[PDB]
Design a protein around this ligand. Structure first.
Ligand SMILES: C[C@@H](O)O[C@H]1CN(Cc2ccccc2)CC[C@@H]1NC(=O)Nc1cccc(C(F)(F)F)c1
Length: 366
């Protein structure tokens, strides 16, 4: 089969896919990109349809099996290699890029392809002088010139690695990045399970970031790392998150935290964070969230936002209810958003959870 990765075994193990895995990141489950479109792998758009089922159909078609929206790294590489072939075809039809591309060795061609993936042909073609320097093998001068650009300002850590690749014609920047992340991960990993960071390592990570593990900032970090569960931090989560956040050190991650916090002010992002909290907090083996844990996280995330939070605590402390289902968790935010200061506009026919109907009856008097 034409796309089999065995057909590439004569290449080096480092390649354009591994390069973009470091610079852009790899996602193995369907997700919505910036513009809200279903995507997988390394930036592989599946469809503009709002239908997840449509996206899954395209994915199942491309992979040759029932993926249910989840793929392996090798499958992502096959999709990516198709995308690279198309990008190279475009480069080769581009009168300004073709001569540069043709002149470069394989490693530096990967650096040029990386640029095209990030900014498109027009963007890359605008680097007239730097492209000429590359064609003339004036590597140090090209590197100096590229570092002066807006590209460098937009993504300095990625751009520095791509520039190093042009300067040296080696994969050194990527080997170094990988080692730095491995060595940092190793500071936190569970000594009995190299696949995750346990409670002790999470505490150490918080200590290194000078944050209280019970702070909202630490939950915000977990949200940005798309962490599955509060009780562990997987190697994959750690690597994907450091990649997505453009950080290869604790100092860089620390500097990123206020930027993460600011995102909560953008449209829909607090809701996304609030909904994330339920799955993160709950025991993986349970469908619902134990009431006591729900109360603790509600107090962390809603204090100062939900004007009836103290009354909600009073109500629940009387309650028996063992646990909270996802829909009830989600709808409390909607309730908080719509409710009048005196609860006078509650719609009992709005199909709110019974828990919220009961709360309104309890609270109105107070
Ligand atoms: C594991 C221990 O050191 O700290 C915890 C105490 N918890 C305190 C708390 C309980 C209930 C409500 C609010 C706060 C919050 C979760 C917190 N655990 C936690 O942050 N886990 C975590 C899991 C994956 C990823 C990350 C993160 F990326 F580092 F943020 C953290």
């Amino acid at each position: 089969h034409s796309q089999d990765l065995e057909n590439l075994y004569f290449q080096g193990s480092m390649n354009i896919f591994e390069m973009l895995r470091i610079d852009e990141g790899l996602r193995l489950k369907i997700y919505k990109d910036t513009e809200g479109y279903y995507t997988i792998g390394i930036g592989h758009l599946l469809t503009k349809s709002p239908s997840l089922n449509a996206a899954k159909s395209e994915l199942d078609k491309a992979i040759g099996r029932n993926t249910n929206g989840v793929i392996t790294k090798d499958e992502a590489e096959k999709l990516f290699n198709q995308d690279v072939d198309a990008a190279v075809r475009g480069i080769l039809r581009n009168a300004k890029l073709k001569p540069v591309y043709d002149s470069l060795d394989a490693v530096r061609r990967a650096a040029l392809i990386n640029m095209v993936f990030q900014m498109g042909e027009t963007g890359v073609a605008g680097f007239t002088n730097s492209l000429r320097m590359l064609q003339q093998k004036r590597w140090d001068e090209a590197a100096v010139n590229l570092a002066k650009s807006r590209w460098y300002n937009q993504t300095p850590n990625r751009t520095k690695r791509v520039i190093t690749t042009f300067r040296t014609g080696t994969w050194d920047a990527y080997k170094n990045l990988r080692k730095k992340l491995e060595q940092l991960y190793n500071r936190y990993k569970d000594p009995q399970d190299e696949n995750k960071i346990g409670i002790d390592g999470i505490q150490q990570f918080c200590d290194d970031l000078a944050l209280d593990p019970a702070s909202i900032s630490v939950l915000i970090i977990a949200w940005k790392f798309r962490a599955a569960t509060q009780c562990e931090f997987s190697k994959q989560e750690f690597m994907d998150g450091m990649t997505e956040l453009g950080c290869d050190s604790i100092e860089k991650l620390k500097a990123q935290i206020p930027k993460m916090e600011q995102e909560l002010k953008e449209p829909g992002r607090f809701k996304d964070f609030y909904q994330f909290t339920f799955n993160f907090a709950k025991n993986p083996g349970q469908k619902g969230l134990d009431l006591e844990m729900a109360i603790a996280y509600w107090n962390l995330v809603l204090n100062g936002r939900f004007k009836f939070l103290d009354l909600w605590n009073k109500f629940l402390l009387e309650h028996h209810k063992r646990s909270i289902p996802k829909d009830t968790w989600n709808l409390l935010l909607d309730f908080s958003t719509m409710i009048a200061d005196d609860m006078s506009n509650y719609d009992e026919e709005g199909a709110w959870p019974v828990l919220i109907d009961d709360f309104v009856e309890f609270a109105r008097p107070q």
